[PDB]
Structure formats: structure tokens, C-alpha cells
Amino acid sequence: VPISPIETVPVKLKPGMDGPKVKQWPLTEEKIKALVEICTEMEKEGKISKIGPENPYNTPVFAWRKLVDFRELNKRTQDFWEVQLGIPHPAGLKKKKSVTVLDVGDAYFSVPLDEDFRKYTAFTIPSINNETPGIRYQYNVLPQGWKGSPAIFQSSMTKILEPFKKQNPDIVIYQYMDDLYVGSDLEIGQHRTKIEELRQHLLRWGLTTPDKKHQKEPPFLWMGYELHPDKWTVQPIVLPEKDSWTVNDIQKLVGKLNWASQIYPGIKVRQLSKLLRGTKALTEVIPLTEEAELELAENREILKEPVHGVYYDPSKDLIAEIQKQGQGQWTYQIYQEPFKNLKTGKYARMRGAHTNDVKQLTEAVQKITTESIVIWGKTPKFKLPIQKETWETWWTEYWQATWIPEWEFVNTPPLVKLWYQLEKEPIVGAETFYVDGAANRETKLGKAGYVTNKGRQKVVPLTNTTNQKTELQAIYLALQDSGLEVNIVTNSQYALGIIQAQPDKSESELVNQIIEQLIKKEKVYLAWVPAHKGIGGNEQVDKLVSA
Amino acid sequence: PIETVPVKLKPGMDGPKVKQWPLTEEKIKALVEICTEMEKEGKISKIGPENPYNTPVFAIKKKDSTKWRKLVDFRELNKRTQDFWEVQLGIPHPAGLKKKKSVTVLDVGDAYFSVPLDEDFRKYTAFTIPSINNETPGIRYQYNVLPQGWKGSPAIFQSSMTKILEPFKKQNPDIVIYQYMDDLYVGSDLEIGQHRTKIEELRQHLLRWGLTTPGYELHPDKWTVQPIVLPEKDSWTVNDIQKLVGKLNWASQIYPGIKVRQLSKLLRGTKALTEVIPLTEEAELELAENREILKEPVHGVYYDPSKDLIAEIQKQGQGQWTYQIYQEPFKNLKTGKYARMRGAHTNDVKQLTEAVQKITTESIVIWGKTPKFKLPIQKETWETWWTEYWQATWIPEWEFVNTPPLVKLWYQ
DNA sequence: TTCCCCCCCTTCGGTGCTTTGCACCGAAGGGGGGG
Numbered sequence: 003v004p005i006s007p008i009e010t011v012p013v014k015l016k017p018g019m020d021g022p023k024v025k026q027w028p029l030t031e032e033k034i035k036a037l038v039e040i041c042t043e044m045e046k047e048g049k050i051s052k053i054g055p056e057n058p059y060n061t062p063v064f065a066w067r068k069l070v071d072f073r074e075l076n077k078r079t080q081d082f083w084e085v086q087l088g089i090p091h092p093a094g095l096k097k098k099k100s101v102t103v104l105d106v107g108d109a110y111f112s113v114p115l116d117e118d119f120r121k122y123t124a125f126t127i128p129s130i131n132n133e134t135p136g137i138r139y140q141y142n143v144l145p146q147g148w149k150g151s152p153a154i155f156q157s158s159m160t161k162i163l164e165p166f167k168k169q170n171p172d173i174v175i176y177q178y179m180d181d182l183y184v185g186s187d188l189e190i191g192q193h194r195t196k197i198e199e200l201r202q203h204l205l206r207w208g209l210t211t212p213d214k215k216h217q218k219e220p221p222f223l224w225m226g227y228e229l230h231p232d233k234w235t236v237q238p239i240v241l242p243e244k245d246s247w248t249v250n251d252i253q254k255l256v257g258k259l260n261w262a263s264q265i266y267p268g269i270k271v272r273q274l275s276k277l278l279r280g281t282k283a284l285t286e287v288i289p290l291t292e293e294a295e296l297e298l299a300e301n302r303e304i305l306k307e308p309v310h311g312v313y314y315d316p317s318k319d320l321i322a323e324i325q326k327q328g329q330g331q332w333t334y335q336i337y338q339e340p341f342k343n344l345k346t347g348k349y350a351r352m353r354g355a356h357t358n359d360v361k362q363l364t365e366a367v368q369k370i371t372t373e374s375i376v377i378w379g380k381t382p383k384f385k386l387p388i389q390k391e392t393w394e395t396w397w398t399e400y401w402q403a404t405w406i407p408e409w410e411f412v413n414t415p416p417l418v419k420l421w422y423q424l425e426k427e428p429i430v431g432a433e434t435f436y437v438d439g440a441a442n443r444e445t446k447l448g449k450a451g452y453v454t455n456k457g458r459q460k461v462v463p464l465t466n467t468t469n470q471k472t473e474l475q476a477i478y479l480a481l482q483d484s485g486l487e488v489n490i491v492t493n494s495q496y497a498l499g500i501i502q503a504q505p506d507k508s509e510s511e512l513v514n515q516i517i518e519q520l521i522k523k524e525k526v527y528l529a530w531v532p533a534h535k536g537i538g539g540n541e542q543v544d545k546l547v548s549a
Numbered sequence: 550p551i552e553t554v555p556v557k558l559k560p561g562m563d564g565p566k567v568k569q570w571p572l573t574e575e576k577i578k579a580l581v582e583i584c585t586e587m588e589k590e591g592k593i594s595k596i597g598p599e600n601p602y603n604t605p606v607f608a609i610k611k612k613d614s615t616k617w618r619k620l621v622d623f624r625e626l627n628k629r630t631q632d633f634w635e636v637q638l639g640i641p642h643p644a645g646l647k648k649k650k651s652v653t654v655l656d657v658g659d660a661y662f663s664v665p666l667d668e669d670f671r672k673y674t675a676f677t678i679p680s681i682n683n684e685t686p687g688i689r690y691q692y693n694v695l696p697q698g699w700k701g702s703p704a705i706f707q708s709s710m711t712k713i714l715e716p717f718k719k720q721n722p723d724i725v726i727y728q729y730m731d732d733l734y735v736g737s738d739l740e741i742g743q744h745r746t747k748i749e750e751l752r753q754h755l756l757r758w759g760l761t762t763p764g765y766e767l768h769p770d771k772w773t774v775q776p777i778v779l780p781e782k783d784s785w786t787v788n789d790i791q792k793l794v795g796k797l798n799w800a801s802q803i804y805p806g807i808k809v810r811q812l813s814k815l816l817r818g819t820k821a822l823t824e825v826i827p828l829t830e831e832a833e834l835e836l837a838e839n840r841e842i843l844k845e846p847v848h849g850v851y852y853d854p855s856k857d858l859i860a861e862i863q864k865q866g867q868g869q870w871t872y873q874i875y876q877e878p879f880k881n882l883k884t885g886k887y888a889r890m891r892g893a894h895t896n897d898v899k900q901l902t903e904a905v906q907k908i909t910t911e912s913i914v915i916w917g918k919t920p921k922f923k924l925p926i927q928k929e930t931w932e933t934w935w936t937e938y939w940q941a942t943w944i945p946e947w948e949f950v951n952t953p954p955l956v957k958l959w960y961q
Numbered sequence: 962t963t964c965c966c967c968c969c970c971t972t973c974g975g976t977g978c979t980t981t982g983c984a985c986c987g988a989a990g991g992g993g994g995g996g
């Protein structure tokens with residue numbers, strides 16, 4: 003009869019399937035014949051027990067100690083629930099006075115399997131150096147290399163540990179890899195008593211936790227961070243300095259910079275990433291330009307001096323500040339006290355072809371809010387370099403709804419402002435152009451022109467252009483030779499959708515020229531009319547471009 | 550004990566495997582408190598790692614109530630069990646609920662706690678509570694009793710609800726009864742005081758029958774599909790007639806009789822926008838005829854229950870919105886507008902949330918089939934902020950829109 | 962020579978619409994931190 007100090011978790015299979023048979027695989031290195039002896043020891047200690055002819059199984063030896071490979075069986079196992087998917091970030095970690103590491107490597111073989119499911123994890127392979135037909139085998143505990151074993155072990159460990167966590171919540175316990183880390187605010191004078199009590203509690207449930215190495219070894223070098231008692235940094239960053247950069251080298255550099263941008267302020271990688279556009283081969287060498295070299299040197303300049311973040315405190319509130327960097331880059335710092343940051347970050351995503359600065363600030367506060375919710379649970383107080391009047395004037399007249407949490411204006415240029423604004427009424431004393439552009443799909447030829455109310459007319463040809471660009475160039479012509487106050491009439495609403503949004507940067511140079519012109523103007527009014535109706539001077543300019 | 554109705558998904562379909570969004574610290578503390586309180590009464594049962602299903606869970610509040618409430622997004626489990634509630638145990642939809650003067654909304658959620666869920670189905674209704682920074686594993690539970698927010702819960706509880714409400718239906722045959730989710734809509738033509746007294750009578754009746762319970766009136770008689778009206782001007786310029794021609798060209802798709810050829814007789818030249826134009830009599834006659842058209846009903850509009858309702862929302866500024874519930878584009882089944890409230894400056898997403906709730910409640914009252922929203926908002930902002938001002942027991946289905954809206958043709 | 966998670970930056974493709982172009986979007990491959 004077997005024994006069980008903790009509850010078993012039932013496991014099923016995918017219906018209609020049975021147990022597979024697997025070809026022999028090479029064994030381990032430190033053992034080639036000791037499999038029978040270790041199996042006998044396991045049978046003595048109750049983890050393994052012989053059986054009869056239950057059903058056809060055949061499993062290999064993994065290529066430490068012996069490990070049975072259930073890879074073909076793992077395609078028949080029930081699907082499980084993964085426990086931990088998002089890794090904690092060091093910033094949202096409380097400051098513990100002391101920590102202690104215990105070993106739970108062997109405790110993995112002390113969680114009994116399901117009595118109904120024990121008949122499935124059977125090893126059916128004899129020795130190699132000797133000559134035996136084959137013995138029986140089945141796991142009375144959680145097998146190694148099983149699909150559902152880690153989740154079951156984690157759930158059992160949580161169930162065991164919860165009664166201790168109930169009494170004294172100040173002590174935190176984390177299970178990474180195959181160890182246990184215990185943190186407490188108690189000094190080492192009384193930390194050992196709590197450690198001994200925890201060890202006794204784990205022993206009462208049938209688990210022993212002896213460890214000696216890392217009980218006195220901070221930092222801990224976890225997942226890429228350098229957790230200390232009351233600070234955290236990233237693991238040291240290596241920056242290649244080879245003169246010749248391939249595409250893969252640039253990708254590696256930009257990835258490393260993106261990773262390192264979480265604790266070092268003022269890291270910009272926007273210019274470097276542009277070099278990878280249109281090139282996909284790692285054997286192609288891309289020459290470096292001036293802006294890329296300047297930004298690369300700038301990034302290297304921060305990393306020599308080391309800085310360390312501080313640990314979060316739940317008794318205060320956290321403040322997030324945003325600064326601009328040009329070309330669509332923003333850098334934010336989140337801190338619970340000035341000069342003692344909790345986190346830093348950057349945002350440079352180009353959301354859409356045509357956007358302005360206020361929309362970028364709106365998309366940049368969202369990322370900070372979401373990250374704060376995920377990490378700290380509370381939204382921070384924003385301190386944006388924008389004026390409340392500009393924010394109101396933008397968000398009360400924009401169709402998309404949006405919100406910002408409680409935020410305070412801070413004066414640190416470059417400030418974020420809307421460069422130009424159109425007029426909602428026709429201007430008195432402004433010449434009213436009527437523009438049109440036409441294009442042909444066959445000849446790839448187009449004509450863009452305009453007719454004024456005073457009788458002035460102008461037409462220009464274009465090649466390798468489409469109708470949308472011809473209309474945009476017609477608007478460009480209307481804006482070029484005109485006074486400060488301008489009235490324009492266009493029969494296409496795509497250019498209206500572009501201009502009315504009032505962009506500040508575009509991925510097409512024609513729109514960039516259009517904003518460059520509209521900045522110089524004083525008052526601009528654009529109106530839309532339906533074409534093909536002979537409305538106003540639109541018929542005349544349509545005839546001019548079409549003939 | 551009582552027999553449990555066998556609830557099974559359609560063959561060839563799996564269960565819900567949706568992840569959960571991160572929550573605020575208070576929406577986790579209150580959630581844990583409420584979940585432990587429900588655990589002490591055997592309402593929810595903890596589950597092990599052998600249950601690979603999950604549904605999102607949020608926390609909300611109620612108007613004039615500081616206590617929090619739990620909410621579970623069954624928007625996918627409802628879809629999976631499409632046959633069960635819709636076919637086997639459907640709920641009739643009266644066509645006379647529109648004509649009532651007043652419609653009141655009541656909560657019957659606690660009446661769903663009595664019926665336990667089927668044993669084979671308890672694994673599908675699994676949810677988890679997350680942790681701040683993911684420091685600790687999320688606490689997982691499953692529903693023991695019948696679950697709120699699920700389509701099949703009313704379909705299963707209607708047999709008992711009919712016995713609950715039969716005496717009131719017989720004694721008061723002038724009041725119409727409708728049930729959707731955990732919401733009970735009662736329609737009457739009485740006055741305010743009599744309606745309030747009758748609502749108190751219904752509350753005490755439900756309490757006496759066994760329901761545990763711990764203004765609120767809507768008036769369908771004040772709803773009307775808004776018509777479009779052409780602009781009226783004492784002084785007419787070239788810009789104004791151009792705008793009118795554009796508006797009538799846009800509206801000619803709705804009404805085939807809209808004419809704009811006579812309107813072009815005043816724009817034969819390249820005249821400036823500011824300059825005035827006297828109005829010819831033929832153009833005035835055609836404009837009056839078009840105004841008369843803009844009051845006639847739309848020809849060819851009918852409601853087909855096979856298709857699904859499509860809603861839209863347009864922000865017109867000044868804290869004002871417009872909406873058009875429809876099935877076929879440019880064939881509006883209903884239109885409307887919504888305005889500000891007592892709050893001087895509250896929020897923009899909150900106003901959108903209230904507009905969505907009003908539109909979907911009206912769509913239930915008129916048709917009983919909730920539409921799908923084309924919300925004009927960033928997806929991340931909506932997903933982050935909707936729960937902070939959302940006070941309802943159920944969730945619609947929304948797809949976000951990223952197009953340039955040139956619609957100034959709804960609010961003047 | 963695995964595979965997956967997370968993150969980022971391009972590329973690609975099919976919708977949605979302003980119509981065989983153009984904008985937005987998600988998902989696919991590469992690059993980072995680990996198992």
C-alpha cells in the first residue's frame with residue numbers, strides 16, 4: 003500500500019487516444035549502467051513499484067540522472083493551466099531587510115501522483131551494459147519531464163505554504179527554478195528563527211529544504227536583473243564596437259539598447275533602427291551615417307556611469323514625468339520621490355501615417371498608465387510639458403474620445419503645442435482658389451491646377467503620380483502663390499481628411515511641404531464640394547486638368 | 550434537491566480560454582473580500598490546475614451605492630452555448646413594450662443564487678483573480694450556483710420566474726413584463742405616483758415569494774427617430790449653398806427623390822464664397838420640396854431578425870453625441886442624439902459609456918436584440934477606463950473604428 | 962537544429978473605404994531577457 007501526505011490532482015487524457023511507443027534514445031553521461039540500481043533504490047523508497055502486463059508502453063532514456071522522455075506521451079496528456087506567465091518587474095518589489103534561499107530540488111519527487119493515473123507513467127526498458135529482458139516500472143510521485151507535473155507541484159506547494167503565509171504576511175516566499183527565496187523585514191538575529199520554523203513546517207508536510215550557498219549571497223542575478231537588498235539594476239550591458247556593422251549586428255544593438263532603456267534615462271534608438279529598412283540579409287553591410295553615429299555615441303555616453311533604481315513603497319504615491327526628444331520620441335521617469343526613480347522608459351511608436359505632437363502625448367500617457375496598472379496597481383500623477391488650454395482646445399474639437407488622469411503642468415521646454423489652426427469661417431478679402439488634380443492609370447500622367455475668382459489660372463504636369471497626389475499637389479499650388487489669408491475649394495475629401503486633422507509629421511514629403519507652407523500662413527480656410535456637378539469654379543479647373 | 554438541466558456546448562466547439570486584464574489594487578482587494586464572503590456560503594468553489602478554462606472578471610459599482618460588485622465577462626461562453634438558451638429555452642419578445650408610457654428596471658440577480666449549476670458544466674465557468682505585479686499566483690474559482698451574466702441562466706430560471714410572477718400578471722394585466730439577463734423591465738401607462746407604488750408592491754411581492762433583495766424610470770413615449778432638416782438662412786451666400794448642395798448629395802442616398810440639379814443654377818460661375826447670391830424661385834420651390842421629403846418615412850425600411858443590429862456613435866463636440874442603429878448601411882432603423890448632464894466637467898469616456906448604456910437599453914426595449922457598437926475611441930483607452938464608470942450587469946459587443954469622420958451633418 | 966512567454970522594430974496581408982489606391986490594423990519573421 004502506498005502513502006500520501008498531500009492531496010492528489012486527477013488527470014485525464016484526450017479522448018480516443020492511448021499510450022505510445024518510443025524508439026530507444028542515447029542515455030545520459032554520468033550514468034550508463036546504474037539505471038537498474040537507481041530503480042531498485044526508488045522501489046525501496048516507494049517512488050517506483052513494479053506492475054504486471056498493464057498495457058503496451060515503450061519510453062526512452064533522456065540524453066543529472068536518468069530521465070524518462072514522455073514526448074510522445076505528452077501529446078496525449080490533458081491540457082493544464084500555467085501558473086506564472088508574466089514575470090514581476092523589480093520596480094514593483096517591496097524592500098525586504100533580509101533574504102534566504104532553500105533548496106526544493108528533491109521535494110519535486112515528494113508530491114504523490116493520482117492513484118488512477120499512476121498506471122500511465124511506466125518505464126519499460128532494460129539495462130544496457132548487462133543483459134536483461136526488462137523490468138516493470140511506474141511513478142508513485144510526480145514524474146520528471148511531464149507536461150502537467152510543474153503546475154501540479156506549484157499548486158501543491160502553494161497549498162502547503164498558504165497556512166504559514168496566513169499567520170505572518172510580512173515574510174514573502176517566491177519559488178523560482180527549483181529553490182525558495184524568503185524575504186523578511188526581520189534582522190538576521192530573528193530571521194533564523196523564522197527560517198527554522200518554515201523548515202519545520204515544510205518537513206511536517208514531507209519536504210526537506212537544505213541550502214547553504216545563496217543564504218548570504220546578494221545580488222541574486224534573476225532573469226536579467228541584479229536584485230540587491232534595497233536596489234536593483236540590469237545585468238551588465240555589452241556594446242559591440244566593431245567598425246563594420248552587418249544587419250544582424252544592428253538588430254542585436256537595437257535590441258540590447260531597448261532592453262537597457264528601462265533603468266538608464268535618455269536612451270534614443272530611433273535613428274539606428276532606420277538603417278534596417280529594406281535590408282533583410284545578415285551578410286549585407288550597411289554603411290553608417292552621421293545621425294546614426296551621433297545617436298549611437300549618445301547612447302554609449304550614458305551606460306558608462308552606473309545608476310540603481312529604488313524599491314517601491316506602498317505608503318506613498320508615484321509620479322510620472324514625460325519629456326520630448328524630437329522626431330516622435332518620448333522619455334518618461336516614474337518616481338515616488340525626486341532623484342530616486344522607480345522606473346524609466348521610452349516611447350517612439352509611429353501610430354499612423356499622419357499625426358501631430360498632442361496625439362503622441364495622448365498615446366504616450368496610455369502606455370505609462372497601463373504599465374503602472376500592471377506593475378504597481380495605481381495610476382501615477384502625470385507631469386506633462388503641455389498647457390491646459392492647448393489640451394482643452396485639442397480634445398474638445400477632436401472626434402475621438404480620450405482622457406488623462408490627474409496631471410499637472412511643468413515648464414521644461416521643448417513644450418508641446420499645436421503649430422497651426424485653420425479657420426471655421428471664410429475670410430473677408432481672401433482670394434478663393436478652386437483646385438483640382440487629375441491622373442491617368444495608363445499613361446501615368448497627371449495635371450494639377452487651380453482657377454481663382456480673379457480669373458488667374460495655373461496648370462502643371464506631373465509624371466508617375468496618382469489622383470490623390472495630384473489633388474494634394476493642386477492644394478500645394480494653391481498655397482504657393484497666395485497671400486497670408488487664403489480660401490481654397492477642393493472636390494476631394496481625402497486631402498480634407500489629411501489637412502483637417504492638422505498633422506505635424508508625415509511619411510510622405512508632399513504633406514510635410516504642405517504643413518511647412520501652412521505654418522507660414524496666417525489664416526487658412528478649406529472647403530469641400532461634390533464634383534461632377536459644375537459647382538463654382540471646380541468645373542473650370544476640372545476641365546483644365548482634364549483637357 | 551432539484552434536477553439540473555444538462556447544459557452542453559455545440560459538438561465540435563471547445564470552451565472559453567480567454568485571459569484576464571490587469572486590475573487596480575482596490576478592484577482586487579474588494580474582489581478578494583467579496584469572493585471570500587461568497588466562499589463562506591458555498592457559492593463559488595476553488596479549482597485546481599486541471600481546469601484549463603478562464604473568463605475575464607472585473608469589479609464595478611452601482612449608483613448611490615459605495616459597495617463594490619463583481620462582474621464576469623461571459624461574452625464568449627454565451628456565444629459557445631448558442632443553441633441552448635436561444636432554441637431550447639428561448640424567451641418571447643413582445644412587440645407592445647414600446648407603446649408603454651413608463652418602463653422601470655429592476656434587479657433579479659439574487660434570485661439566481663438558488664439554482665445550482667450542472668456538474669459537467671462547472672469547469673467551463675472558471676475565473677481567476679490576479680495579483681499586483683504577478684508576485685503571487687492568481688486565485689482561481691468556479692461557479693457552483695447558476696451564474697449571473699450568462700445567457701443560459703434566464704433560460705433555466707424562467708420556469709421558476711413564471712411561477713413567481715403569475716399572480717402579479719393576473720392581478721395587473723395592464724403591465725407588461727420582460728426579462729433580459731438579470732434585468733426585469735416593467736412597462737405601464739400609469740402616472741408617476743401610481744407607478745412608484747406599484748413598483749414597491751412588486752418589490753414586496755418578490756420579497757414575500759422568497760427573493761433576497763438588499764429615479765429609475767424610462768419613458769419610451771419620449772423616443773422618436775430624429776429627422777434631418779435642411780438649413781434655414783435669412784442671408785444666403787455661395788458657401789452656404791455649397792454646404793447645402795453637399796448635404797443634399799449626401800442625403801440623396803437615403804432619399805432617392807432628393808434633387809440638386811436646380812441648386813446648381815446659382816453656381817454657374819467662379820464666384821467668391823463670401824459674396825451673396827439672391828435666391829431664384831425655382832430653387833426655392835425645389836428646396837421646399839426637399840424639406841417636405843425630409844419628413845416622409847424612408848421607403849424600403851424593415852426589420853429582419855436574421856441579421857444583427859449595427860450601432861454607430863459620432864462625437865459632435867460640446868459633450869454631445871449622435872447615434873444611428875441600423876442593419877443595412879444608409880438604411881437607419883433608428884437615430885438619436887444625446888447631450889450633457891448635471892456634471893459641469895466630468896469626463897469624455899464616461900459620457901461615451903453612458904451613451905452606450907442608453908443606446909443598448911433602448912435597443913433592448915425596441916427590439917430585444919443588442920446591437921454591436923462602432924465606438925469612436927482608442928481601444929487601449931476604452932479597455933483601460935470603461936470599468937471605472939460602467940454600472941450595468943452585462944456587456945455589449947463592440948468593434949472599434951479608425952476612419953476619418955467628416956460627419957458634420959448630424960448636429961448643427 | 963526544440964518549442965513557448967515577454968518586449969521591440971519592420972514586413973506583409975487582407976479589410977474598409979476616400980474605391981485596382983490608401984489608411985489602419987493584426988500577425989508573421991528577425992533582435993533582446995530567461996525557462
Ligand SMILES: Cc1cc(/C=C/C#N)cc(C)c1Nc1ccnc(Nc2ccc(C#N)cc2)n1
Binds near residue numbers: 183220231684
Ligand atoms: C520576485 C522575487 C524575486 C526574488 C529573487 C529571485 C531570484 N533569483 C525573490 C523574492 C522574495 C521575490 N518576491 C518579492 C516579493 C515582494 N517583495 C520583494 N522584494 C525584494 C526582492 C529581492 C530582494 C533581494 N535580494 C529583496 C527584496 N520580492
